[PDB]
Amino acid sequence: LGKFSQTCYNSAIQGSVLTSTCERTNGGYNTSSIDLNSVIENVDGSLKWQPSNFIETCRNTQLAGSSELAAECKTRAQQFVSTKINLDDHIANIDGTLKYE
Ligand SMILES: OC[C@H]1O[C@H](O[C@H]2[C@@H](O)[C@H](O)[C@@H](CO)O[C@@H]2O)[C@@H](O)[C@@H](O)[C@@H]1O
Numbered sequence: 001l002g003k004f005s006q007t008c009y010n011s012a013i014q015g016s017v018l019t020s021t022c023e024r025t026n027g028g029y030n031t032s033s034i035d036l037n038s039v040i041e042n043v044d045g046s047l048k049w050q051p052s053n054f055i056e057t058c059r060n061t062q063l064a065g066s067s068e069l070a071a072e073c074k075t076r077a078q079q080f081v082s083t084k085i086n087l088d089d090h091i092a093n094i095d096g097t098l099k100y101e
């Protein structure tokens with residue numbers, strides 16, 4: 001499941017939008033973007049795979065490593081702590097286009 005990083009490169013993240021160049025099944029490269037906001041939630045300090053507008057309570061979203069997304073999110077105590085999530089869990093590349101599965 002996911003692992004889009006095996007056939008995609010030059011991945012970048014700005015705010016909640018993931019943008020990356022992926023290879024097509026029939027050869028050739030395709031570029032696309034998808035809003036992860038509809039699939040990431042903030043649970044008492046940690047980002048989880050569920051819709052809830054996480055960026056509304058999180059800031060400094062940035063790309064970490066090859067497939068990890070690092071950000072800071074508010075805990076119930078109203079404090080920003082370091083949080084991270086593996087994009088490889090559900091973000092896959094189907095025909096050069098990214099699709100959550
Ligand atoms: O690296 C192997 C690749 O294999 C599987 O995907 C296949 C196909 O469904 C894809 O459309 C094309 C790329 O466009 O590649 C394969 O033929 C998946 O397991 C994929 O995650 C993996 O990277």
Ligand SMILES: OC[C@H]1O[C@H](O[C@H]2[C@@H](O)[C@H](O)[C@@H](CO)O[C@@H]2O)[C@@H](O)[C@@H](O)[C@@H]1O
Pocket residue numbers: 041042043044045052053054055056057074075076077078
């Ligand atoms: O916009 C709704 C908000 O709800 C959930 O977070 C709750 C709580 O855990 C937070 O500490 C405070 C703000 O600090 O807000 C809510 O009561 C999460 O799903 C969050 O992502 C979402 O933005």
